[PDB]
Design a protein around this ligand. Sequence first.
Ligand SMILES: Nc1ncnc2c1ncn2[C@@H]1O[C@H](COP(=O)(O)OP(=O)(O)O)[C@@H](O)[C@H]1O
Ligand SMILES: Nc1ncnc2c1ncn2[C@@H]1O[C@H](COP(=O)(O)OP(=O)(O)O)[C@@H](O)[C@H]1O
Ligand SMILES: Nc1ncnc2c1ncn2[C@@H]1O[C@H](COP(=O)(O)OP(=O)(O)O)[C@@H](O)[C@H]1O
Ligand SMILES: Cc1ncc(C[n+]2csc(CCOP(=O)(O)OP(=O)(O)O)c2C)c(N)n1
Ligand SMILES: Cc1ncc(C[n+]2csc(CCOP(=O)(O)OP(=O)(O)O)c2C)c(N)n1
Ligand SMILES: Cc1ncc(C[n+]2csc(CCOP(=O)(O)OP(=O)(O)O)c2C)c(N)n1
Ligand SMILES: [Mg+2]
Ligand SMILES: [Mg+2]
Ligand SMILES: [Mg+2]
Lengths: 548, 548, 548
Amino acid sequence: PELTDGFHLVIDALKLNGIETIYNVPGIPITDLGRLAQAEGLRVISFRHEQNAGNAAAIAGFLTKKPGICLTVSAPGFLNGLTALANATTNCFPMILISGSSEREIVDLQQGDYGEMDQLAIAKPLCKAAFRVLHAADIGIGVARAIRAAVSGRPGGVYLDLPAKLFSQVIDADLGARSLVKVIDAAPAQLPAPAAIARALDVLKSAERPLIILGKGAAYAQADEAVRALVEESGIPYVPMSMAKGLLPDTHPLSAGAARSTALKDSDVVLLVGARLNWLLSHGKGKTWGEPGSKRFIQIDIEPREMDSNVEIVAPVVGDIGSCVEALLDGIRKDWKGAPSNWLETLRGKREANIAKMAPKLMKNSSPMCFHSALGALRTVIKERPDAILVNEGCNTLDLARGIIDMYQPRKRLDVGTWGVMGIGMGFAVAAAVETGKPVLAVEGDSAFGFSGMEVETICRYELPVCIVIFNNNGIFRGTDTDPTGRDPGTTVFVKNSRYDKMMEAFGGVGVNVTTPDELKRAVDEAMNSGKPTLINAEIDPAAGSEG
Amino acid sequence: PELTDGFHLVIDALKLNGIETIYNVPGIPITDLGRLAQAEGLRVISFRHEQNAGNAAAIAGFLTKKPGICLTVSAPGFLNGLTALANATTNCFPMILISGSSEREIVDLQQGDYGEMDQLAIAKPLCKAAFRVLHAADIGIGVARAIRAAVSGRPGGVYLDLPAKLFSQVIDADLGARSLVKVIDAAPAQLPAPAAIARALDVLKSAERPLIILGKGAAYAQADEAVRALVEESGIPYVPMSMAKGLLPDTHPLSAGAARSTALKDSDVVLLVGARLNWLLSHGKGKTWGEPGSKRFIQIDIEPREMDSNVEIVAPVVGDIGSCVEALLDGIRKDWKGAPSNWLETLRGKREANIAKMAPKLMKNSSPMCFHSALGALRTVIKERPDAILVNEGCNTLDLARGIIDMYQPRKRLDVGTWGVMGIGMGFAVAAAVETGKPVLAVEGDSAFGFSGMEVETICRYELPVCIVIFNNNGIFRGTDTDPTGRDPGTTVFVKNSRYDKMMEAFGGVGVNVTTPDELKRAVDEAMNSGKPTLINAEIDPAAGSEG
Amino acid sequence: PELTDGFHLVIDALKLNGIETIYNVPGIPITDLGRLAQAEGLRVISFRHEQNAGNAAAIAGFLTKKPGICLTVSAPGFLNGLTALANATTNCFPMILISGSSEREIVDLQQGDYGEMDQLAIAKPLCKAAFRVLHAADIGIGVARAIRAAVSGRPGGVYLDLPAKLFSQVIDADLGARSLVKVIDAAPAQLPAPAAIARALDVLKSAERPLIILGKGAAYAQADEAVRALVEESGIPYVPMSMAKGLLPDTHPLSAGAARSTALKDSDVVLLVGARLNWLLSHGKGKTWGEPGSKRFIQIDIEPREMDSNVEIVAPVVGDIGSCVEALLDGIRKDWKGAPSNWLETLRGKREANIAKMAPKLMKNSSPMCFHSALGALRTVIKERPDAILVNEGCNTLDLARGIIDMYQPRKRLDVGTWGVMGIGMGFAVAAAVETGKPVLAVEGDSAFGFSGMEVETICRYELPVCIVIFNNNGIFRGTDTDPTGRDPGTTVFVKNSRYDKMMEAFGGVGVNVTTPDELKRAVDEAMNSGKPTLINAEIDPAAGSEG
Ligand SMILES: Nc1ncnc2c1ncn2[C@@H]1O[C@H](COP(=O)(O)OP(=O)(O)O)[C@@H](O)[C@H]1O
Ligand SMILES: Nc1ncnc2c1ncn2[C@@H]1O[C@H](COP(=O)(O)OP(=O)(O)O)[C@@H](O)[C@H]1O
Ligand SMILES: Nc1ncnc2c1ncn2[C@@H]1O[C@H](COP(=O)(O)OP(=O)(O)O)[C@@H](O)[C@H]1O
Ligand SMILES: Cc1ncc(C[n+]2csc(CCOP(=O)(O)OP(=O)(O)O)c2C)c(N)n1
Ligand SMILES: Cc1ncc(C[n+]2csc(CCOP(=O)(O)OP(=O)(O)O)c2C)c(N)n1
Ligand SMILES: Cc1ncc(C[n+]2csc(CCOP(=O)(O)OP(=O)(O)O)c2C)c(N)n1
Ligand SMILES: [Mg+2]
Ligand SMILES: [Mg+2]
Ligand SMILES: [Mg+2]
């Protein structure tokens, strides 16, 4: 009768579970797998490097709460994708790295097969889960296992190994169709115990200076209405982490973002909503949090092992952010005195003061452009385009764009994440445009852009509405370092006055060079209104910024 | 008295053992280490991605027989360099991956440190050896162990973990000097037992159709005149593997490289000199080697475990290739009746027949230009510049240049190696220029170039004598595949008529576009005579080549 | 002021979190730690082999829902305990392996330290979590991380590495006390989504022949009242897995355990309660589960990744068993038409018929005594002592005892578990006596007893009320195999008539040798009435049973 093969079973299983996009790099043994995927209706985005394909799948999971799919080749390409898979596991982004595998009997004897590697054994230390499928009748379960492990609990990167012999296996079509699995409740809701919610309300009500910390886990949870209702109805000031910006508008009257240091030092009870007390929050120790013993933490997290990871947590609340926030909110709507207005006014005054010190730098046109004057232009662009996605990476380009550029809608800012990775830029830009269809503004340091620069060709090839702004200051941090022996360039500088706009022109994209904030503002508007792939080489003062 | 620190002990340990070059990417916590190396006289080449820095270190080890040094950054950058470190282990290239790491007490408890990763534990499954240095007094011993493990036995990649607190430690300067170790016999000679040489000669004399196969291990050994004497004085025909080309000149009268399939099929005794019976030699099984049981193998390898890896080896000879071929040459000099005449003259038959079949394809003009006609010009360049270095990667551009371009001096060709990696090009080109001082011809496929093309800025920054030729056929293998749904481009194509030469001009380099073999020869000759960094975009027929 | 050290901080951290018993084997560097633990009130149990101390800590966690503590020694003893730690992770038992480790700077360079091993990196691929504490101020958080990982989520074995340098560090006593963490909600409740509960009930209400399967996860949860109510109020027949026997009395009228084949083969909807569809349930595949597509599974489990692991689960319920069973039970009390009576009467007939065939063998008293008749005596013992603990391991001794001996109270049967490990017997028996204070009856095969028999001295030394019954059939499976060459004993046999009773008396315990079921009965009653350590050597027909 009718027959099917491993090629079609893999594709049929992915389509059955809502997968629409495959980021990949072709080659042996997965070339015809990607072709069949494209012929079956899936959109296939081919990159110049598997790591950039993996970065796209990673941020795609963050944007969609569905696992981003990265398909790669044996050993060398698998390793390029595994580095992105490890970064996805670090940031709690759901993702499935699918990779071709060589002949199992040669690899297990280490006889030197083509692209030889026990990729299953190599992947496990660096990701959340790893599975290998040897039989075509198990492709449905294998994909189902990979999806569950990627989106359930704490989301993360999963590795799905498919040996080349699997694709050519042939079984009965009706048998294979019944073997496919459409996953029921891939990321199930987990509700907290009422005894834990009651303990959290008790601590929260006792606070003289409470504070909510919104992490990117709260943004990933996509409980926007519930999270915002928790902030407003409680009246407690909040501070968003980098990728939680825009969940509430960064100009919200309860936002203490421009007063982050005071809100963290002077608070007494802190509510962590999908935010880890890691290096980004000084591990809960030091002067950042005031004197030892002055803090009490309530924590909302799907992973119960994250509790007591750094300091004592008196009110652990385990469950998905959607279910736990609504449980806290339902306890607040039935009983809540109010946040002390003294704490509100202290943060509001210090916030306005910091914004006042910031305002002159934004309107300080000078030659050459400083970081502040250029970001003042891009901040207005985002304010005028609150639906656009902002990719951002670098050091000065990153740390200053985070504090200057206000976000207004959730999940619109995508940056270096937990490992502080340089190289996420162009891969994130491709996935942001592919997944959402919104315009992407990619604010890049010139050192950060170089880690993934060749993907501007991929951006051009698929005609994506990405506007790349390179803060060209001729180096890492600054461009003033020099060789004391007078023989080489500096360890941290690049070719002086590099014209990255000419690099974009090499692939049919728009290339612009600007030297003033107004020239930058006009060039960005032209690019984001037209939707054409654009790279804007912006000249930044090589002396401005910091070495850190 | 005077004090020193871990920053200086690390440099003084590397200086003491002959390290002259550091390939790296600056950042936390190793930026000051790279600046001090510049101040202490080492050459620091800073790349745009860490993988290309490590690819440079791997090929620099192959060229120098001294370990190549890649200095990287914590976890995100360590993983980027670890990929190339694993490739060096696969190709037996001596290399040391030096990476900073975070606080040991925060990573041990997995509390989310800056760039958190137990890089020692993660490196061990992927490289030859891994070490971590906690105390400054052990920096010298740590560097010693890293060097010995890198160059001794079968060479390979070594990871050296330096925690950030190690640099800041301060000890007595005189005590620190007496802690440094100048390694004695880092790669010692290993001489084979006479009874194993005798077993080999008995098998060799019994041969009626003997064959020598020179692998890149023999080219790495730098026993050139001995290896050549073994070939010429025994009269036995030889077949050179890819990167063993040029060890003997490829037009040598004893070369059966143009009769490779006949030499491998009909021979009865094969002498492997630093060559593994892996996928590159069909694992010693199948029709490539004629009928089963018709082969007896003599294998010369430093690794005793390489024997009997795939098929039975009747005459194993374990030791460094220098000591082994010389001991084998003495036995031949004392007792050898020559090589059977009709076997050498049968190979000359198929050799001259295959070359004559190739000739009309090297002179056939076409529009667009094909692979064979363009490589016929590049073959003349290498013949006219016989001491220039050839870097070559791709698929059609790789396999066709390997058979068309003849090398004349040893260690002059650097290609994808054992894993078939794409992305080594610009890294190998940088190291070849820096380590040797020779000119570099980089023959690249457009897909292969994309994996590492961003480093053309590094090629320009240090003004290295690199001439890049992109075989632009608009995609992988071919440039004709299309999306059957007509929505996106095909999975294996790129932006049609991409002008990579414009990208080179973005960083100050020379950019040329050529369309004929005659134009290609002029541009290469001008670039390699001037020594200026140059990228030549060669338009290749999108329909030429092989689809696989 | 007042000072404290790492020794006291480790002990006080365990005492603060409710730890009361430490299973260990003393040595360098943890000898003085165990001494301090005993001096500080904790009960320290010293074994003859670390693997048996770990097996004690493993089943101790299953019995108490608090992690069992094994203290071991560097590398060689760590590896012994790690083997038990891996098995605890396989069986989802909460357990912490605390090992001392060598000098970190010497191990990191692999210089050959006393007990040199990176025990953190070795334990990670074999257990659920692993941490290493370097500073005394992190001992409190370190213990809190080990406890949370051990009991929360799917419980499992955790490794806690304590370098020897840690124990001797001295800090302020008030600073040290404030650094301790008393874990809040170490194993939090996880409530299921109402929509998931609605889906399960609807699938349940549509069942013509529903079946409940209770796994040892339901026994571990200690929701005995809720689980018994779910079965008795729904009227659905249930099948208990091995260590779930007794949760409901094995003679409960709703039990179909004596009709297991018909229940598993002919049912249509199967509610798994803490049971995995693994080898012990034929992976939900094959004739065991009837015809393909005749089954629909509801699964209650705390691990969301366990769903769809073998076959498709149409109704996954994710949460702790206490919350999910109560959630199911709440809806059943609102609307439930009652279980189909034809399904009950069909199974009740099969249960009556099956027990009839087992009946004659249970009282067939031949000479030598056979497996069925001897276990028939021990089946009477457990009925008369429903509060006593049963430990059971072997092959024939395991399978037949599992089916013949009925359990009447929850968590009284402790057997080989998920991996089928031989050697859990004596370690489990020590933990069961110490943790529960109840009489322990250990039914052992002579081959299984050899994996841990040396621990009978541990039983005697601590005067534990353990009654050991060795089923001495003189070999593995059977004692009839011989050497076909007539030189050695058979590969599977032992010394004929080995007097394990006279071995017990070598350490002060009571030893008996019985040959009839009544002799076994009178000896077991006498042993368990007195509470003295006793071993009965029961002479079993060497030809009885099966093999393989
Ligand atoms: N759906 C979810 N429900 C609850 N917690 C979540 C969910 N998704 C992610 N998290 C938690 O969010 C936390 C994010 O921590 P981090 O990634 O450090 O946020 P940021 O880095 O913005 O502070 C992780 O601990 C993760 O477990
Ligand atoms: N100095 C040396 N002396 C002897 N054998 C060596 C030396 N350096 C490398 N080798 C051997 O060379 C062999 C190269 O195998 P391969 O890398 O497969 O060469 P190719 O790929 O050109 O055949 C390896 O087995 C390695 O052990
Ligand atoms: N507290 C709990 N709440 C829910 N499920 C649990 C709990 N403790 C253990 N489990 C589940 O119990 C299951 C045990 O499966 P198994 O160990 O195979 O039981 P048996 O061996 O009787 O089948 C595991 O999947 C584990 O996740
Ligand atoms: C993969 C990786 N490699 C290296 C680093 C170290 N690093 C941190 S920031 C940075 C570059 C910062 O320079 P740039 O992108 O030009 O932004 P600027 O500060 O100059 O505005 C680097 C290389 C890193 N974080 N990740
Ligand atoms: C890291 C890695 N990714 C993917 C592959 C699969 N692969 C094999 S050859 C090749 C590129 C061939 O295209 P090109 O470089 O343009 O040479 P051409 O055949 O077009 O002349 C690729 C991507 C690989 N070998 N390595
Ligand atoms: C650690 C370990 N080693 C080996 C085995 C293999 N094995 C399974 S059952 C068994 C012994 C069965 O013989 P016995 O314990 O005497 O019980 P009997 O069947 O004779 O009643 C063994 C060795 C195992 N399950 N575990
Ligand atoms: Mg910069
Ligand atoms: Mg190409
Ligand atoms: Mg036995």
